[PDB]
Design an enzyme around this catalytic site. Structure first.
Site, mmCIF file in Angstrom:
data_model
loop_
_atom_site.group_PDB
_atom_site.id
_atom_site.type_symbol
_atom_site.label_atom_id
_atom_site.label_comp_id
_atom_site.label_asym_id
_atom_site.label_seq_id
_atom_site.Cartn_x
_atom_site.Cartn_y
_atom_site.Cartn_z
ATOM 1 N N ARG A 65 0.936 -0.999 0.069
ATOM 2 C CA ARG A 65 0.097 -0.195 -0.047
ATOM 3 C C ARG A 65 0.968 1.290 0.070
ATOM 4 O O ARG A 65 0.336 2.315 -0.350
ATOM 5 C CB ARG A 65 -0.949 -0.074 1.192
ATOM 6 N N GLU A 104 20.389 -2.489 21.384
ATOM 7 C CA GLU A 104 18.991 -2.539 21.097
ATOM 8 C C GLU A 104 18.331 -3.756 22.088
ATOM 9 O O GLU A 104 17.410 -3.292 22.724
ATOM 10 C CB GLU A 104 18.729 -2.679 19.407
ATOM 11 C CG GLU A 104 17.299 -2.896 19.707
ATOM 12 C CD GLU A 104 16.811 -3.503 18.189
ATOM 13 O OE1 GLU A 104 17.341 -4.571 17.884
ATOM 14 O OE2 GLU A 104 16.248 -2.949 17.394
ATOM 15 N N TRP A 153 16.436 3.692 16.055
ATOM 16 C CA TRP A 153 15.147 3.913 16.352
ATOM 17 C C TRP A 153 14.769 5.208 16.305
ATOM 18 O O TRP A 153 13.680 5.415 16.523
ATOM 19 C CB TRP A 153 14.640 3.085 17.614
ATOM 20 C CG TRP A 153 14.394 1.673 17.612
ATOM 21 C CD1 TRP A 153 15.334 0.938 17.683
ATOM 22 C CD2 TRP A 153 13.009 0.938 17.369
ATOM 23 N NE1 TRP A 153 14.839 -0.532 17.561
ATOM 24 C CE2 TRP A 153 13.486 -0.267 17.448
ATOM 25 C CE3 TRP A 153 11.846 1.628 17.262
ATOM 26 C CZ2 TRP A 153 12.326 -1.250 17.077
ATOM 27 C CZ3 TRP A 153 10.852 0.667 16.813
ATOM 28 C CH2 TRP A 153 11.271 -0.637 16.751
ATOM 29 N N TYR A 186 8.319 -3.544 21.768
ATOM 30 C CA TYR A 186 8.869 -4.983 22.210
ATOM 31 C C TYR A 186 8.968 -4.764 23.968
ATOM 32 O O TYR A 186 8.570 -5.811 24.517
ATOM 33 C CB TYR A 186 10.119 -5.192 21.493
ATOM 34 C CG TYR A 186 10.075 -5.714 20.370
ATOM 35 C CD1 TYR A 186 9.611 -6.842 19.896
ATOM 36 C CD2 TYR A 186 10.456 -4.653 19.265
ATOM 37 C CE1 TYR A 186 9.735 -7.299 18.562
ATOM 38 C CE2 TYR A 186 10.268 -5.070 17.980
ATOM 39 C CZ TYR A 186 9.897 -6.502 17.358
ATOM 40 O OH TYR A 186 9.747 -6.691 16.074
ATOM 41 N N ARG A 244 6.775 -27.156 27.301
ATOM 42 C CA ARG A 244 6.391 -26.774 25.820
ATOM 43 C C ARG A 244 5.859 -25.558 25.746
ATOM 44 O O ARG A 244 5.238 -25.141 24.634
ATOM 45 C CB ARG A 244 5.623 -27.747 25.170
ATOM 46 C CG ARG A 244 6.487 -29.309 25.164
ATOM 47 C CD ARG A 244 5.801 -30.358 24.420
ATOM 48 N NE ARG A 244 4.561 -30.812 25.246
ATOM 49 C CZ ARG A 244 4.212 -31.808 26.077
ATOM 50 N NH1 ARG A 244 5.408 -32.489 26.304
ATOM 51 N NH2 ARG A 244 3.241 -31.938 26.813
ATOM 52 N N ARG A 245 5.721 -24.461 26.754
ATOM 53 C CA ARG A 245 5.122 -23.426 26.736
ATOM 54 C C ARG A 245 6.281 -22.101 26.907
ATOM 55 O O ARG A 245 5.917 -21.160 27.489
ATOM 56 C CB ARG A 245 4.182 -23.131 27.578
ATOM 57 C CG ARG A 245 3.084 -24.264 27.458
ATOM 58 C CD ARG A 245 2.211 -24.221 28.592
ATOM 59 N NE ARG A 245 2.895 -24.491 30.024
ATOM 60 C CZ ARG A 245 2.386 -25.627 30.869
ATOM 61 N NH1 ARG A 245 1.368 -26.395 30.402
ATOM 62 N NH2 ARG A 245 3.138 -25.747 31.739
ATOM 63 N N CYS A 275 8.047 -7.094 14.131
ATOM 64 C CA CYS A 275 8.105 -7.906 12.643
ATOM 65 C C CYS A 275 8.555 -9.348 13.640
ATOM 66 O O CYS A 275 8.622 -10.327 12.786
ATOM 67 C CB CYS A 275 9.359 -7.565 11.846
ATOM 68 S SG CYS A 275 9.062 -6.161 10.871
ATOM 69 N N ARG A 313 7.291 -12.452 11.064
ATOM 70 C CA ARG A 313 6.197 -12.308 9.967
ATOM 71 C C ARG A 313 6.986 -11.636 8.860
ATOM 72 O O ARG A 313 6.270 -11.708 7.799
ATOM 73 C CB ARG A 313 5.101 -11.434 10.661
ATOM 74 C CG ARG A 313 5.493 -10.262 11.029
ATOM 75 C CD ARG A 313 4.083 -9.395 11.210
ATOM 76 N NE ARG A 313 4.508 -7.790 11.310
ATOM 77 C CZ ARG A 313 4.955 -6.874 10.535
ATOM 78 N NH1 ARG A 313 4.972 -7.317 9.199
ATOM 79 N NH2 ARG A 313 5.456 -5.707 11.077
ATOM 80 N N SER A 314 7.995 -11.001 8.822
ATOM 81 C CA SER A 314 8.138 -10.002 7.823
ATOM 82 C C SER A 314 9.820 -9.996 7.865
ATOM 83 O O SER A 314 10.325 -9.458 9.126
ATOM 84 C CB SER A 314 7.564 -8.709 7.887
ATOM 85 O OG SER A 314 8.255 -7.667 7.006
ATOM 86 N N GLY A 315 10.480 -10.493 6.820
ATOM 87 C CA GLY A 315 11.813 -10.271 6.938
ATOM 88 C C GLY A 315 12.392 -9.326 5.673
ATOM 89 O O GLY A 315 12.291 -9.749 4.644
ATOM 90 N N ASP A 316 12.898 -8.270 6.159
ATOM 91 C CA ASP A 316 13.726 -7.288 5.203
ATOM 92 C C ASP A 316 15.094 -8.088 4.921
ATOM 93 O O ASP A 316 15.799 -7.681 5.783
ATOM 94 C CB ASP A 316 13.809 -5.790 5.842
ATOM 95 C CG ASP A 316 14.797 -5.016 4.862
ATOM 96 O OD1 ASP A 316 15.230 -5.453 4.249
ATOM 97 O OD2 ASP A 316 14.692 -3.733 4.992
ATOM 98 N N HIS A 373 11.356 -10.891 2.068
ATOM 99 C CA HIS A 373 11.377 -9.787 0.778
ATOM 100 C C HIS A 373 12.561 -9.317 0.643
ATOM 101 O O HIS A 373 13.348 -9.014 1.633
ATOM 102 C CB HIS A 373 10.172 -9.031 0.927
ATOM 103 C CG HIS A 373 10.007 -8.359 2.338
ATOM 104 N ND1 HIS A 373 10.350 -7.107 2.743
ATOM 105 C CD2 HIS A 373 9.575 -8.820 3.382
ATOM 106 C CE1 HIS A 373 10.012 -6.799 3.726
ATOM 107 N NE2 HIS A 373 9.503 -7.748 4.302
ATOM 108 N N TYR A 432 13.554 -5.828 -0.922
ATOM 109 C CA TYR A 432 13.314 -4.303 -1.617
ATOM 110 C C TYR A 432 14.006 -4.366 -2.993
ATOM 111 O O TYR A 432 15.194 -4.644 -3.262
ATOM 112 C CB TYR A 432 13.268 -3.124 -0.670
ATOM 113 C CG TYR A 432 12.420 -3.320 0.390
ATOM 114 C CD1 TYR A 432 11.288 -2.473 0.207
ATOM 115 C CD2 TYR A 432 12.624 -3.716 1.737
ATOM 116 C CE1 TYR A 432 10.278 -2.703 1.164
ATOM 117 C CE2 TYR A 432 11.803 -3.541 2.698
ATOM 118 C CZ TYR A 432 10.564 -3.119 2.592
ATOM 119 O OH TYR A 432 9.663 -3.092 3.643
#
Lengths: 283, 284
Positions: free
Chosen positions: B24, B61, B83, B109, B149-150, B169, B189-192, B230, B232
């Protein structure tokens, strides 16, 4: 190669080099940590064939969760009893939640999916307009911003764990849209390889078919990611039997009606074509 | 095979058969969905070598988020500015958060890890005793119930998204104990792939070393699982350059004193041994 061989190879790997561990409750498993498998949804539906998977349960359970229920009695009324043990007053008592009516599972999947972050009361409460509706969230993104990288539905709320009959094994699913196809990745923290994982693969593959149908897409891939993948020692013998069986061609799944919303599906909307499994295996 | 080849293979796969999609934002990526790689932590530390990774930023960080901070100014004051663009009043106003003071990232985070489910006020508020402390939770399990396992820390709270400068992410990490070793799996969820993922690998590998140290275990494996992986399109040429480079042997990581609590680590405590990367590759 038959995609079911991924699951069978995972079993073999755990049996061969899995760590043998006891937990604090004194039960032993063989396990490996970190696995991934991919199941195509395009030309077939990945309902495993080296044993008969409880499809009737898969379907009723998913529809039950999608409408936000946390009442095992409403699932039980459909004829599917797999949550009845967890909903029993004696189970709840054992959990330290004796203050409940039979059936009140606490803020499990149905509540997290439709009302994340809301204050749980009981399984009869009206939570309309409370919490974050993750199902509506992901349907809107798939429809209106399909390339978004935040198409997530999450069941893990640590602040709610002490109220749940069981903590969820399926922590979250993420969806992805490319070239007219909807794919899904599940992160599963704990995979009971013998009793659960074939059923789990079917659950999220079905969810993906339903979402694709509602949004005008075709099903693409289901990516199954495991954390603690384990075999209970009492399941090793029946799994040895299962591993001697050759996979048969996967069935196909057809949806019999135009359905516009994730809440309007009924079990009879689903046509499973040519499912010819090897016999049921009792673990 | 050198483990960094997994990352380089993932780059090649995305370039070869990645889906060409616009967001978007209109910014284009090439992407693939669903990947997994494994990095051993036993005898080396997987700090990538085909470009120089910003280690000082990795350490500062992580320590900043472990103490629960949501204040980018607190990180900036250590000398690490990664940041600052997201914590600027300009960026925050762009996000619809124009009431925030400079630095106030919202419930990112630090807040999720230490106060999950609490009501966010601002970056200055005292949240002592509020919400679910997931860091204390996982340390207790690793110590006292290691085969549980938690053992999970989760940063995804959809109810808080509208308050965050940026959505996380790194959705969750799960830990595993076997044979005296601590392993970690990250669901991202999202890897640059160009700017982020090498840094990300280092972050959670460091977290695993820290946890192992505090709980008396040895580090085992780091399992990296990606959702939307992904590239860029503006990163294609610098990554094609990186792909011409041969990995060097990974460095080692030493911890220089006994530290009994996660909150007690300082950047002084870490020594990176024999890090010999190829030069820094700048990317847009």
């Amino acid at each position: 190669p038959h995609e079911e061989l991924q699951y069978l190879r995972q079993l073999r790997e755990i049996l061969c080099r899995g760590s043998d561990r006891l937990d604090r409750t004194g039960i032993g498993t063989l396990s490996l940590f970190g696995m991934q498998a991919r199941y195509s949804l395009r030309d077939h539906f990945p309902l495993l064939t080296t044993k008969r998977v409880f499809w009737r349960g898969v379907v009723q359970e998913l529809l039950w969760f999608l409408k936000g229920s946390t009442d095992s009695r409403e699932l039980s009324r459909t004829g599917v009893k797999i949550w009845d043990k967890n909903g029993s007053r004696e189970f709840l008592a054992g959990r330290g939640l004796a203050h409940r009516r039979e059936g009140d599972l606490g803020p499990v999947y149905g509540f997290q999916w439709r009302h994340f972050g809301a204050a749980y009361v009981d399984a009869d409460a009206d939570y309309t307009g409370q919490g974050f509706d993750q199902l509506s969230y992901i349907v809107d993104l798939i429809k209106n911003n399909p390339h978004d990288r935040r198409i997530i539905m999450c069941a893990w709320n640590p602040a709610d764990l002490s109220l749940m009959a069981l903590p969820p094994c399926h922590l979250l699913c993420q969806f992805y849209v490319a070239d007219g196809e909807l794919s899904c990745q599940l992160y599963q923290r704990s995979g009971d390889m013998g009793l659960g994982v074939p059923f789990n693969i079917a659950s999220y593959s079905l969810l993906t078919y339903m979402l694709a149908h509602v949004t005008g897409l075709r099903p693409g891939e289901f990516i199954h990611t495991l954390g603690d993948a384990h075999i209970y020692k009492t399941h090793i013998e029946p799994l040895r039997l299962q591993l001697t069986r050759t996979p048969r061609p996967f069935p196909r799944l057809e949806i019999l009606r135009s359905v516009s919303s994730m809440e309007e599906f009924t079990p009879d909307d689903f046509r499973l074509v040519d499912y010819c499994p090897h016999p049921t295996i009792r673990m």
